[PDB]
């Protein structure tokens, strides 16, 4: 990939920015830019390409065959009991969180039992992330 | 891919931004841009391509075959009981969350038992994320 | 892909923005742009392409064959009982949330048992996300 950028606040090619309570006077700004970009990217020039798959079963005997793909989840248990018991008392809860299997971004590509692949595959993530903020 | 950007506030090619309580006076700004972009991208030039799949079964005997694709989820349990008991008492709850299997983004591509693929595949996420804010 | 941007507040090619309580006086701004973009993108030049799939079954004997595609979910259980008991007491709940299996964006593409694919596939997500905000 090319030119993948995370900029936290400000982006410019050229900047003349003036901020706070400043005096900016008699300034002469002159700019002459030549900025040309040429991209020949992810380009393919092929005579022949073959993705051949063949399965042959002769006079064979097959019994109890199990093929299982990735991410198989079996008998998973989450037990998260919350119990509050109070008498003659005071409870103050602020920003209290119980979080079970919380997901932000899930990117899945080519998750398979069998795969034949030719070419390009790409995953990009750019993120500003805050889970909890309080005061 | 090309030119994939996260910018937190401000984006320019040229910027002259004048912000707060400033004096900006007698300024001469002159600008002369040539900025040309040329893209030959994700381009393909091919004489032949073949995606061939063949299954032959002859005088075979087949019993108890299971083929199971990815992300099989079986007999999963979430148990999250919440109990409050009070007498002569005070509860103050502010911003209290119970969160089970919460998703933001799920992107799934070519999730299969079998795949034959030629060419380009792409996933992009760009994000400002905040789960909790309180005050 | 090309030029995929997330900008938090403002985007411009050339910007002369003046913000707050500022004096901007006698300013001379001159601009001369040439900015041409040329795109040859996802272009294909092919003489022959073949997607062949063949299944041949002769005098075979087949019994108990199961093919199961991805994301199979079986006997999943969610138990989230909430119980509040109060006498001579006070409950103040503000911004209290119980969230089970909540989804924002779910994108699924080419999710199948078997697939033969030629070309381009793409998923893009751009987002400002707040789950909870309160005060």
Residue numbers in the entry:
A (entry chain A), B (entry chain B), C (entry chain C): 120 to 254
Quote what the paper states about this structure:
The TMEM106B folds shared a similar five-layered ordered core comprising residues S120–G254 and contained 17 β-strands, each ranging between 3 and 15 residues. We observed three TMEM106B folds, with no clear relationships between folds and diseases.
Our best maps for filaments with folds I, II and III had resolutions of 2.6, 3.4 and 2.8 Å, and came from case 1 (sporadic Alzheimer’s disease), case 19 (MSA) and case 17 (MSA), respectively. For all three folds, we determined the structures of filaments that were made of a single protofilament. In fold I, this region packs loosely against the other side of the C-terminal hairpin-like region with the formation of three large amphipathic cavities. Likewise, there is an extra density in front of the side chain of Y209 in fold I, but not in the other folds. Individuals with fold I were homozygous for T185 or S185, or heterozygous, indicating that fold I can accommodate a threonine or a serine at position 185. Owing to the compatibility of both residues with the glycosylation motif at N183, no differences in the associated glycan densities were observed. Filaments with fold I were more common than filaments with folds II or III.
